[PDB]
Amino acid sequence: KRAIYPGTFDPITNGHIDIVTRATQMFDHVILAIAASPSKKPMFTLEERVALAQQATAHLGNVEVVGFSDLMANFARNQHATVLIRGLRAVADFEYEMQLAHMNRHLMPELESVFLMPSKEWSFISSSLVKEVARHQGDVTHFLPENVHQALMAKLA
Amino acid sequence: QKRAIYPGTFDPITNGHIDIVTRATQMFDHVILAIAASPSKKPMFTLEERVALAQQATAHLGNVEVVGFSDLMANFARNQHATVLIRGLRAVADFEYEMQLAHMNRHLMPELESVFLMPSKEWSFISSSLVKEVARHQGDVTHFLPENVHQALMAKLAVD
Amino acid sequence: QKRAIYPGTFDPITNGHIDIVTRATQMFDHVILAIAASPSKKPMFTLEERVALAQQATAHLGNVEVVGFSDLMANFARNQHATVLIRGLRAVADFEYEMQLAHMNRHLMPELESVFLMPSKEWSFISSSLVKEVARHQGDVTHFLPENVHQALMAKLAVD
Amino acid sequence: KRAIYPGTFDPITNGHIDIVTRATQMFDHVILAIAASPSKKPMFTLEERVALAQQATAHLGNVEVVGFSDLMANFARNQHATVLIRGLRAVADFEYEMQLAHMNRHLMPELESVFLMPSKEWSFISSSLVKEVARHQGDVTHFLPENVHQALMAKLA
Amino acid sequence: QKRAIYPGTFDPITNGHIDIVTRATQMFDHVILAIAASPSKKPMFTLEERVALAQQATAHLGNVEVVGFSDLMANFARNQHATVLIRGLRAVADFEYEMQLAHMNRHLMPELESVFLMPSKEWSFISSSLVKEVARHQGDVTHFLPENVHQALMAKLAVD
Amino acid sequence: KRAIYPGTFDPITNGHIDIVTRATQMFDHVILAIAASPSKKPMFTLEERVALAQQATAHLGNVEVVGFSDLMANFARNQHATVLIRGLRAVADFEYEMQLAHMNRHLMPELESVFLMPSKEWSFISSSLVKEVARHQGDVTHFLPENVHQALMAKLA
Numbered sequence: 045k046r047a048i049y050p051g052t053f054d055p056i057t058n059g060h061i062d063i064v065t066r067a068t069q070m071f072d073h074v075i076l077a078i079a080a081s082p083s084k085k086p087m088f089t090l091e092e093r094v095a096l097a098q099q100a101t102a103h104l105g106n107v108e109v110v111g112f113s114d115l116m117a118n119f120a121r122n123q124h125a126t127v128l129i130r131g132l133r134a135v136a137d138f139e140y141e142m143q144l145a146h147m148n149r150h151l152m153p154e155l156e157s158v159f160l161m162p163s164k165e166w167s168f169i170s171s172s173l174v175k176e177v178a179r180h181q182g183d184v185t186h187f188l189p190e191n192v193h194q195a196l197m198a199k200l201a
Numbered sequence: 202q203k204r205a206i207y208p209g210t211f212d213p214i215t216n217g218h219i220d221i222v223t224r225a226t227q228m229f230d231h232v233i234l235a236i237a238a239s240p241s242k243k244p245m246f247t248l249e250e251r252v253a254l255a256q257q258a259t260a261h262l263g264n265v266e267v268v269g270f271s272d273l274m275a276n277f278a279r280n281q282h283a284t285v286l287i288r289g290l291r292a293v294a295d296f297e298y299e300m301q302l303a304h305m306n307r308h309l310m311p312e313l314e315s316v317f318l319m320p321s322k323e324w325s326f327i328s329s330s331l332v333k334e335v336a337r338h339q340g341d342v343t344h345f346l347p348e349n350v351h352q353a354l355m356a357k358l359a360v361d
Numbered sequence: 362q363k364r365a366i367y368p369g370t371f372d373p374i375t376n377g378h379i380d381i382v383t384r385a386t387q388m389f390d391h392v393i394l395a396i397a398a399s400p401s402k403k404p405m406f407t408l409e410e411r412v413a414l415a416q417q418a419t420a421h422l423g424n425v426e427v428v429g430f431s432d433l434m435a436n437f438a439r440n441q442h443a444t445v446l447i448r449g450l451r452a453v454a455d456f457e458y459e460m461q462l463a464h465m466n467r468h469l470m471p472e473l474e475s476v477f478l479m480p481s482k483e484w485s486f487i488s489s490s491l492v493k494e495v496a497r498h499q500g501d502v503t504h505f506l507p508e509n510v511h512q513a514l515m516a517k518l519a520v521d
Numbered sequence: 522k523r524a525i526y527p528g529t530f531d532p533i534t535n536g537h538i539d540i541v542t543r544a545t546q547m548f549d550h551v552i553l554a555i556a557a558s559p560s561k562k563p564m565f566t567l568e569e570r571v572a573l574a575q576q577a578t579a580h581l582g583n584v585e586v587v588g589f590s591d592l593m594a595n596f597a598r599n600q601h602a603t604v605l606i607r608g609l610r611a612v613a614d615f616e617y618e619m620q621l622a623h624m625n626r627h628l629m630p631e632l633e634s635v636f637l638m639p640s641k642e643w644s645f646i647s648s649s650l651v652k653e654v655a656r657h658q659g660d661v662t663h664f665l666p667e668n669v670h671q672a673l674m675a676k677l678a
Numbered sequence: 679q680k681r682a683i684y685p686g687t688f689d690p691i692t693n694g695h696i697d698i699v700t701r702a703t704q705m706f707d708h709v710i711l712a713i714a715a716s717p718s719k720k721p722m723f724t725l726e727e728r729v730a731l732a733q734q735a736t737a738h739l740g741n742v743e744v745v746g747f748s749d750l751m752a753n754f755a756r757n758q759h760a761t762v763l764i765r766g767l768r769a770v771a772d773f774e775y776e777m778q779l780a781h782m783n784r785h786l787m788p789e790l791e792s793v794f795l796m797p798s799k800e801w802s803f804i805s806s807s808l809v810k811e812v813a814r815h816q817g818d819v820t821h822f823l824p825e826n827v828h829q830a831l832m833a834k835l836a837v838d
Numbered sequence: 839k840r841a842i843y844p845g846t847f848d849p850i851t852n853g854h855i856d857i858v859t860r861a862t863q864m865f866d867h868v869i870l871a872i873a874a875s876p877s878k879k880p881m882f883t884l885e886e887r888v889a890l891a892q893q894a895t896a897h898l899g900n901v902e903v904v905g906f907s908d909l910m911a912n913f914a915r916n917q918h919a920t921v922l923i924r925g926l927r928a929v930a931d932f933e934y935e936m937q938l939a940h941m942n943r944h945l946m947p948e949l950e951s952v953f954l955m956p957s958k959e960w961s962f963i964s965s966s967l968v969k970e971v972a973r974h975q976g977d978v979t980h981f982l983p984e985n986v987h988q989a990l991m992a993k994l995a
């Protein structure tokens with residue numbers, strides 16, 4: 045059973061690590077898929093985001109990190125994935141996630157979009173929030189893998 | 202060989218529940234559709250009627266087991282060797298209570314992973330409660346139920 | 362010649378309900394303020410007291426008819442030749458349940474269009490339930506009710 | 522009775538067609554009013570959006586499509602409209618819609634802002650979502666009138 | 679010399695409530711942890727048991743007074759010369775009802791300012807209701823309660 | 839007891855005046871702190887926003903208006919503030935406010951983030967909404983202090 049965990053992962057946080065770890069305990073193979081997302085004007089290039097996530101998930105045997113600029117439904121079909129995973133955080137996320145799930149169902153009916161719930165520890169964080177704290181030199185070591193913390197600082201310094 | 206549990210009161214089982222359990226069978230090897238006694242909710246159908254209705258309505262799905270339970274859902278999940286807990290999500294109200302429940306279940310049984318599925322747009326605005334209220338007030342709910350459930354509900358309301 | 366229905370339990374009718382039904386009369390030719398028996402909710406005022414209070418409180422609005430009903434709201438709407446169903450919306454909780462209700466009503470009577478109105482900011486945080494709870498616990502709710510309702514509620518609580 | 526159905530309509534979708542059709546069954550005359558919305562940096566010019574909506578609603582006898590750059594309350598007063606219609610989709614929309622409705626009530630007390638609920642079929646779509654799928658070459662034929670689908674493809678190709 | 683009131687049913691007091699009242703003592707000179715009789719909710723513990731549990735669980739906090747009340751919360755707040763009303767906020771459901779309550783309380787006692795505090799992430803998904811339901815169904819709730827409350831709840835369920 | 843009321847205040851509205859007035863009835867000293875917020879591309883410069891808020895709160899004896907570009911938690915510590923105040927308006931605000939409060943608690947555990955509820959009168963307004971009405975020449979005199987209304991008009995004219 046192949047699951048895809050998609051997102052912008054700009055950068056990947058401990059909240060994303062928690063969801064992908066839960067996904068590997070549930071499915072045989074997990075693809076952590078990083079969308080190019082040029083409309084979101086990401087801080088890190090797609091190549092940087094893939095390298096950060098590869099380094100951050102290296103300890104997990106059944107995670108494959110890949111980047112994509114394709115339609116999500118086409119990339120899932122092309123990865124032979126039948127499960128799409130998203131972490132369920134806040135109401136704004138949940139409602140937007142419902143819209144994407146219904147759109148993906150229209151494009152690929154056999155692709156099941158499911159939600160996992162993060163640990164209470166990571167329930168109030170996001171890449172956007174971690175970047176905002178880091179832009180003001182605030183300590184974000186607790187929220188990110190070591191390699192990501194170094195990269196965020198290098199990008200801002 | 203993942204075992205998933207899909208718990209609820211299923212009073213009665215609706216097309217919304219059938220949609221969720223069907224999606225679960227496409228994802229997991231074995232799905233237990235677990236029916237909670239739920240006495241504090243004062244159910245319309247007894248546990249045995251609820252189990253027989255769910256069995257008939259899921260008989261075409263080869264990897265579904267319908268079972269009744271009166272214990273803490275997490276105690277039953279543990280005894281059934283389930284590592285996945287299926288929850289259907291339709292809207293905002295579902296989400297907030299579902300988050301409390303999922304954290305509590307994680308505290309009780311950390312090895313049990315809550316996974317949230319979405320029903321078809323067709324069943325995204327229905328609940329057993331609304332179906333029961335409409336049928337009690339002489340409204341047509343045939344569209345929302347499996348045939349056997351429609352028959353059972355008409356018979357229940359004819360004498361109540 | 363559009364006929365609109367504004368249903369509810371109106372237990373009792375508040376300034377929030379008066380605000381909504383007033384806005385409806387400015388939009389539609391005829392408005393039926395339809396009062397549901399609602400026995401499962403165990404109302405404070407009987408249907409007849411609820412109808413008489415609403416009649417007195419809306420007497421100044423020439424195109425409002427106050428009527429009691431015990432049937433499925435959509436069955437009553439159909440029999441009254443109503444093609445518009447008025448719902449008052451104050452916040453998020455209202456919205457989610459209102460969406461389920463509106464889809465169910467559309468299934469039951471497709472020709473009945475649900476239209477959601479917003480009350481004045483003044484009444485956007487009140488409900489009959491909160492007004493009743495406050496008055497039962499000796500709080501001042503005069504501001505939220507029509508004069509006749511304030512008088513009726515004081516008399517009800519004096520003997521209960 | 523004159524109703525106004527305002528929005529950015531960038532582009533008009535089947536969700537908008539559903540709401541405007543419901544509005545014509547309720548009110549004698551419906552004005553579908555397209556706001557210039559330069560702050561939203563729309564994909565289509567105001568002239569393009571008006572032509573798309575005119576073509577898409579031509580089959581509805583009592584719809585008039587117009588563009589405007591004015592304050593909503595002033596445009597409604599100037600159209601002799603006493604009802605403003607918005608489709609009720611998600612929580613984020615509902616809360617923002619409450620703010621606009623209360624602001625419009627302060628500016629024009631006789632203008633009643635009301636909500637209609639779209640069909641379940643269009644309950645999870647938006648112009649933004651349809652544009653995102655289309656930017657990735659995904660099939661959006663189901664969500665748009667034929668002329669709009671052709672225009673979206675021409676604009677992106 | 680600000681006096682704050684922290685009202686609730688506290689049936690029973692949880693670590694979530696302890697967290698909120700602890701934060702309140704760091705902000706205000708005197709905090710009244712006010713326990714509502716709340717008969718319409720049918721509480722598990724009597725008012726006297728609820729007060730004794732809260733007193734023992736807050737004994738280490740020098741500026742907390744635990745007091746029972748049966749009146750309208752705003753009437754009690756006024757009589758206690760409280761000008762601050764503490765509410766704990768965990769999620770969306772809390773927020774909407776809390777806004778209605780806060781506006782009603784402001785209408786009743788304008789000089790009483792509602793202030794909303796957030797509990798630790800640790801207690802952000804628990805409620806007395808969920809703790810009671812879990813314990814009644816033989817689940818482990820030790821983590822969510824003060825030691826004396828855990829002891830009292832085990833004794834209550836052993837005989838009920 | 840020192841409380842900080844932070845925000846972008848671009849510009850300060852009657853909704854902000856209501857919250858800061860409530861804060862002065864609760865705490866001995868209130869710092870109304872204006873974040874530079876360059877990522878939000880504010881309409882008014884930080885210097886303009888501070889002058890507008892100083893003039894608007896001059897009648898309140900225990901309010902001090904200050905601007906800052908620092909991390910919120912560091913600015914609060916440096917102001918000897920132990921209470922952070924935010925006004926509770928809508929769900930989207932509440933959920934974002936929870937995220938900031940939990941982040942601020944990680945950075946400064948003794949800083950208590952609390953919420954005050956605005957008057958029903960200001961429950962549906964925001965700086966963004968007032969600016970949108972003003973950009974379309976709509977009457978915003980009711981929502982703003984006199985000096986702010988003059989400044990908004992001067993900036994737009």
Ligand SMILES: CC(C)(CO)[C@@H](O)C(=O)NCCc1nc2cccc(O)c2[nH]1
Pocket residue numbers: 050051052079081113114115116117118144147148151653654657659
């Ligand atoms: C990364 C993401 C999961 C964050 O939410 C989402 O932005 C996304 O999937 N980007 C890829 C392009 C795309 N956008 C789509 C929208 C609806 C259906 C699709 O298949 C889509 N593909």
Ligand SMILES: CC(C)(CO)[C@@H](O)C(=O)NCCc1nc2cccc(O)c2[nH]1
Pocket residue numbers: 208209210237239272273274275276302305306309811812815
């Ligand atoms: C019917 C239901 C699946 C729908 O929500 C849920 O109410 C439930 O689980 N009922 C069984 C008793 C129980 N109540 C619990 C509360 C928290 C954690 C548990 O494991 C629980 N078990």
Ligand SMILES: CC(C)(CO)[C@@H](O)C(=O)NCCc1nc2cccc(O)c2[nH]1
Pocket residue numbers: 334335338368369370397399432433434435436462465466469
């Ligand atoms: C009082 C009320 C207007 C406020 O919500 C609503 O509860 C209602 O309609 N009560 C009548 C019985 C009924 N229950 C129904 C449920 C769905 C569709 C119907 O037509 C219904 N009629």
Ligand SMILES: CC(C)(CO)[C@@H](O)C(=O)NCCc1nc2cccc(O)c2[nH]1
Pocket residue numbers: 527528529556558590591592593594595621624625628970971974976
């Ligand atoms: C298109 C729209 C309905 C989408 O929501 C909204 O952006 C809008 O109305 N744009 C026109 C200018 C305006 N913006 C206003 C804000 C509040 C009150 C008014 O009268 C406004 N007029």
Ligand SMILES: CC(C)(CO)[C@@H](O)C(=O)NCCc1nc2cccc(O)c2[nH]1
Pocket residue numbers: 494495498685686687714716749750751752753779782783786
């Ligand atoms: C327990 C509680 C603190 C949690 O919410 C709340 O239910 C309450 O306050 N109970 C006392 C009676 C009352 N009910 C009221 C309703 C509105 C305004 C009041 O002052 C009220 N007092």
Ligand SMILES: CC(C)(CO)[C@@H](O)C(=O)NCCc1nc2cccc(O)c2[nH]1
Pocket residue numbers: 176177180182844845846873875907908909910911912938941942945
């Ligand atoms: C103005 C504001 C209160 C509006 O919400 C917020 O944008 C803010 O605080 N800006 C300053 C920089 C900062 N951003 C942070 C995010 C999390 C924790 C911090 O200490 C932060 N400091």
